[PDB]
Write a protein that binds this DNA or RNA. Structure first.
Ligand code: K
Ligand code: K
Ligand code: K
Ligand code: K
Ligand code: K
Ligand code: K
Ligand code: K
Ligand code: K
Ligand code: K
Ligand code: MG
Ligand code: MG
Ligand code: MG
Ligand code: MG
Ligand code: MG
Ligand code: MG
Ligand code: MG
Ligand code: MG
Ligand code: MG
Ligand code: MG
Ligand code: MG
Ligand code: MG
Ligand code: MG
Ligand code: MG
Ligand code: MG
Ligand code: MG
Ligand code: MG
Ligand code: MG
Ligand code: MG
Ligand code: MG
Ligand code: MG
Ligand code: MG
Ligand code: MG
Ligand code: MG
Ligand code: MG
Ligand code: MG
Ligand code: MG
Ligand code: MG
Ligand code: MG
Ligand code: MG
Ligand code: MG
Ligand code: MG
Ligand code: MG
Ligand code: MG
Ligand code: MG
Ligand code: MG
Ligand code: MG
Ligand code: MG
Ligand code: MG
Ligand code: MG
Ligand code: MG
Ligand code: MG
Ligand code: MG
Ligand code: MG
Ligand code: MG
Ligand code: MG
Ligand code: MG
Ligand code: MG
Ligand code: MG
Ligand code: MG
Ligand code: MG
Ligand code: MG
Ligand code: MG
Ligand code: MG
Ligand code: MG
Ligand code: MG
Ligand code: MG
Ligand code: MG
Ligand code: MG
Lengths: 326, 64
RNA sequence: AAUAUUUAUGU
RNA sequence: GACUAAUUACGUGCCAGCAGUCGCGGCAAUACGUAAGAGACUAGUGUUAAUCAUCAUAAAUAGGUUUAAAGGGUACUCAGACGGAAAAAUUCGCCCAAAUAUAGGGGACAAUUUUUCUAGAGUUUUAUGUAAGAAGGUCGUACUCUAGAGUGGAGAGAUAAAAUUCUGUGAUACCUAGGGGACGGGUAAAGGCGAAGGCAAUCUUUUAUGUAAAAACUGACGUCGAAGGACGAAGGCAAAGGGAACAAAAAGGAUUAGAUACCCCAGUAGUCUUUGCAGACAAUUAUGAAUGCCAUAGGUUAGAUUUUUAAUUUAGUCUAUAAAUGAAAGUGUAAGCAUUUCACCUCAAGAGUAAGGCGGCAACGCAGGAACUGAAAUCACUAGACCGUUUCUGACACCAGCAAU
RNA sequence: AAGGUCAUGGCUUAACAAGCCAAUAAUUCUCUUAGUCGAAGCUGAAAAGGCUGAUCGACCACAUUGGGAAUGAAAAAAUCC
RNA sequence: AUAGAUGAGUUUGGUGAUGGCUCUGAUUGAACACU
RNA sequence: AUAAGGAGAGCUCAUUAGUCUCGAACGAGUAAAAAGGAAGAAGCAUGGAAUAUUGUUGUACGACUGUUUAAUUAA
RNA sequence: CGGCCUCUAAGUUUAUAAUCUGAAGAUUAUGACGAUGAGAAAACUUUGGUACCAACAUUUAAAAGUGAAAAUUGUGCAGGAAGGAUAAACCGUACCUAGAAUCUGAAACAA
RNA sequence: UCUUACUAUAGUCAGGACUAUAAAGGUCCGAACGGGUUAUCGUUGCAAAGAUAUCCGAAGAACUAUGGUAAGCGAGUGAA
């Protein structure tokens, strides 16, 4: 028996090290992905000088960008207002996004749309968004205004978009919004999710809690327990492509294909181009690490504007303080 | 038993791996005796074709 | 009835 | 000197020297060096080297492996050894019986083969009983986190005593409401189950043996088993999860002459899930598996029979004994009488080490010497002594009191 | 099937068949050591005893080392190339 | 070939075992030393 | 690793299962492509002229492919 | 057989509106302009893999071979434009292409 | 209109070999092409950067064409 060229071990793909640039290449295994082209009318090209890191003035405002592969932007639906069932047609790969997208189809009208696919979502699954209100059948089946236990059993399914108030405590969500009528902004990246910590509610004398406040607390991917609107949207599940951060590019040329240009260190420059440049030989100049414009690059210096206080935070993030993790 | 060691989590059942080996060996000792005793009688061929018992089940050494 | 300091050496 | 037949005197004084083994010599040496005597062999006599025997000390005749060198981690199993009853055919093995014996005789036994038998080994009849195993789910006691603008308002926790530490950002304590992980109280026993390793909350699903009684069935189909393969505790490697609790490491506080440590505040790997690697254990009954056999008693486990009250009985397990066995301790369902088979041992130490090789990602594992150096290593028991050992017995030994230094 | 042979055997050949030996090392390879055997010598009470492989007899190999052939009834040479 | 089978010293406070070493017997195509 | 180190090569020719051609299954043919052998001839020499610039070993530095002072430093 | 002409990319804009701004101006939207691309017919003519026309590979105008064009199928990840559609005017046409008289290198320059 | 980077639209890379692929490689040998390692020549040079030979990359972080954007109080661009 001979070892195959493609070597699957766990959930990652490695290849025969027949070149020094392919020895450390590691890819996550996603074979269920649609192999064709995307839904063209839901896309538009991504071109212009902005691809190189320039703004409307023509000067570089984002360094280390340009020269990547030609791409198209996918119009993903982060609001999901239209109600009714939606059939997942196929899970596609999005170059301008870490997680995967799902081409859904509204069975009522037939219109197609894109949404961030969940971990485990496959073609054929039926997702539904209860953000525009509950349908008459579901309300009648209870026969009452709402029941927290009954609702969660018929709507808290993977891929379903609900108001965070309707999702029970301890559930994992990955498209958490902030405003009552805003789009999903948190945990949209691959493998990210958020947990519902608490809800401003009270007991109704029958053991059934009822919302009393206007917000609910959720722990974000960064470990921050902040406050979010009661009517803010959320999708049940976890963002797909959980093994994204375990990938390895293996060679410099792959980073260039991803629109990333070389990063020149400050020590490598002269005293005129960086606070770290200068000196004969390798020398840091006894200068504390900073950016090319004097911004402390280490030590815990926070770049969030002081006057801009986060009034939605219940428990701030935990600061590692420079201590080694592993 | 062979159908149970192949189902979900069947590989984890490492204690009954000897039970399957003990049944195939207990059957090897009955086929090896029935072959020389029956002298290829019609009663011996009816069991083979019906149960599908090939020579690999008793002739050599069953290694599992 | 479940207490508990310290104690090395000897052609 | 003793082994080993044969003595004194003088000199030397752990010096010089003797010596095959044990040993001798430190100022009155039968052991060294002289003198004499004695014992013995003799043209030979001693010494060195080597071989046989001593040595059953590599045991085929003919050994042994509980505690002294030595039972493999396990049993399914190819090869290979061994293995029923009553007849028959062939070999003429075996025997007369040799001379490597032509040709015959004898038939108990042996080999291949044939026909029958049922005591061995199996199958059926849902056994009972049972922490073997595996899958998918759950339960609960405590713990832990968060929340309530909780009550309460200065202590708590730790230890022999403390310190580091927690607490006014409201702890400990007493509650309410949620989240999250692993753990398995009682029942519980000398108890049971699997090849062993090992297996103890619960529901359902799933899995091979084993045990009892009756009949029925197959008709020797059996036991052991190098290697290969499979399984194999904890710890560990690898990948992806989980992370309350415990806890190597690292670090801090004490103790101490010093303290890496034992003790303490905390704490990362790791323990847990999934998939592989790894294969080493006081993997133990310090006792390989299996078969036949030997006298009783008191418990106990799962059945059966009965005049089921209580007595018989099958298969296990555990104490105490008889004959016997053993170095003895002890065993006595075996460490006895025998038998079969596999593994292993041949003075200690070097050494389970070296070198090459094989396996593994690694850690390491399998396998496995020789040189140099010794006359001893080693087991069980016996009587004492000792114990920061138990329980007693005497003493101004101590306690108490008085007096004194 | 045919030849060959006193006779037998792929001994030899033609045409078919895919067998034969072995499976635990048949076979092959590397290393260390050695002339083999005999109441021939020594030894033990003895074991199908052990050791040696001098003098004695039988066998094998060699003749500076390596590589080779012929003559002859037969290499069985301290020969010959 | 029917006479042919043997022990001793040395481990321990001591006893009994296990287990090596050495001695006692015979010998050499022997060597050395004193003769 | 195209490691190293070797062998072969042109011309004439025996030979030919199929393909192709010719004549009439067969026969013939390289004024068909190919295959082909320990065959042969000539010369000092048949990779004949031209084209492809050695091999091996031990170190330091930097993993590697790349980039740089246009026009003295390519590392 | 190209331009002109139609459509648009990267972009531009003393065009319009709104907004920001010491003045100059800048921003966003729309419009206009803007090829290095796309544009019917002819040896006579006037929806989104039901997809798409990036790279690579394959197949296909039937005697064979070869080179294109266009299309078919498939592969890899680096995931691969926009918009409009669908009786003959005007402008270019000469020569030179760098070893033998013409382009750039100060020039009849071994670049 | 040079040059650095980016951008849009386009174009180019004989033949052969290895590798799991018919096509999956900052793979290999080597032209065009792109570089400029070493030496010589030249130095009022043919040339204010050339010639010859040798050497390196040559399916890529490649090369090339026509346009566009970003530069001069603050520094544009910069694999530095
Ligand atoms: K054992
Ligand atoms: K006879
Ligand atoms: K019968
Ligand atoms: K005994
Ligand atoms: K050693
Ligand atoms: K350059
Ligand atoms: K202005
Ligand atoms: K030229
Ligand atoms: K090359
Ligand atoms: Mg950056
Ligand atoms: Mg970086
Ligand atoms: Mg850098
Ligand atoms: Mg520098
Ligand atoms: Mg500075
Ligand atoms: Mg320096
Ligand atoms: Mg398990
Ligand atoms: Mg002492
Ligand atoms: Mg005496
Ligand atoms: Mg003497
Ligand atoms: Mg002594
Ligand atoms: Mg004397
Ligand atoms: Mg004499
Ligand atoms: Mg073992
Ligand atoms: Mg062991
Ligand atoms: Mg007979
Ligand atoms: Mg019967
Ligand atoms: Mg029976
Ligand atoms: Mg039962
Ligand atoms: Mg309060
Ligand atoms: Mg509180
Ligand atoms: Mg739980
Ligand atoms: Mg055990
Ligand atoms: Mg319990
Ligand atoms: Mg049992
Ligand atoms: Mg067995
Ligand atoms: Mg084995
Ligand atoms: Mg383990
Ligand atoms: Mg582990
Ligand atoms: Mg890990
Ligand atoms: Mg420590
Ligand atoms: Mg400490
Ligand atoms: Mg702790
Ligand atoms: Mg294993
Ligand atoms: Mg065994
Ligand atoms: Mg009993
Ligand atoms: Mg028991
Ligand atoms: Mg007993
Ligand atoms: Mg030893
Ligand atoms: Mg070793
Ligand atoms: Mg070993
Ligand atoms: Mg005692
Ligand atoms: Mg007193
Ligand atoms: Mg007193
Ligand atoms: Mg020799
Ligand atoms: Mg001789
Ligand atoms: Mg003692
Ligand atoms: Mg010649
Ligand atoms: Mg380099
Ligand atoms: Mg390079
Ligand atoms: Mg230069
Ligand atoms: Mg240079
Ligand atoms: Mg226009
Ligand atoms: Mg154009
Ligand atoms: Mg000119
Ligand atoms: Mg010129
Ligand atoms: Mg290359
Ligand atoms: Mg000159
Ligand atoms: Mg190269």
């Amino acid at each position: 028996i001979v070892t195959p060229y493609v070597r699957d071990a766990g959930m990652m793909r490695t290849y025969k090290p027949h070149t020094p640039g392919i020895r450390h290449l590691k890819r996550p295994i996603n074979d269920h992905l649609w192999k064709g082209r995307p839904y063209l009318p839901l896309t538009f090209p991504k071109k212009g000088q902005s691809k190189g890191g320039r703004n409307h003035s023509g000067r570089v405002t984002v360094r280390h960008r340009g020269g990547g592969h030609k791409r198209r932007i996918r119009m993903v639906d982060f609001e999901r207002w239209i109600p009714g069932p939606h059939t997942v047609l196929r899970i596609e790969y999005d170059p301008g996004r870490s997680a995967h997208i799902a081409l859904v189809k509204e069975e009522a009208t037939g219109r197609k749309s894109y949404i961030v696919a969940a971990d485990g979502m496959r073609a054929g699954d039926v997702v539904q968004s209860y953000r525009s209100g509950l349908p008459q059948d579901l309300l009648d089946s209870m026969g009452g205004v709402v029941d927290p236990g009954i609702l969660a059993a018929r709507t808290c399914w993977r891929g379903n978009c609900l108001p965070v108030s309707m999702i029970p405590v301890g559930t994992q969500i990955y498209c958490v919004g902030s405003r009552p009528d805003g789009k999903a902004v948190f945990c949209r990246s691959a493998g990210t999710y958020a947990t519902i910590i608490s809800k401003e509610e009270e007991t109704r004398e029958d053991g059934t809690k009822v919302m009393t406040g206007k917000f609910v607390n959720v722990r974000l991917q960064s470990g921050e327990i902040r406050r979010v609107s009661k009517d803010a949207c959320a999708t049940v599940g976890i963002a797909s492509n959980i093994m994204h951060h375990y990938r390895q590019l293996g060679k410099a040329g792959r980073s260039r294909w991803l629109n990333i240009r070389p990063t020149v260190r400050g020590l490598a420059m002269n005293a005129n181009d960086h606070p770290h440049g200068g000196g004969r030989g390798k020398s840091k100049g006894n200068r504390h690490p900073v950016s090319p414009w004097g911004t402390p690059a280490k030590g815990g210096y926070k770049t969030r504007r002081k006057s801009n206080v986060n009034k939605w935070v219940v428990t701030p993030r935990v600061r590692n303080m420079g201590v080694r993790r592993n | 038993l062979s159908k149970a060691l192949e189902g979900h989590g069947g590989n984890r059942d490492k204690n009954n791996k000897r039970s399957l080996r003990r049944l195939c060996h207990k059957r090897q000792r009955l086929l090896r005796y029935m072959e020389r005793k029956e002298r290829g009688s019609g009663r011996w061929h009816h069991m083979l074709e019906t149960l599908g018992l090939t020579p690999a089940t008793w002739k050599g050494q069953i290694t599992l």
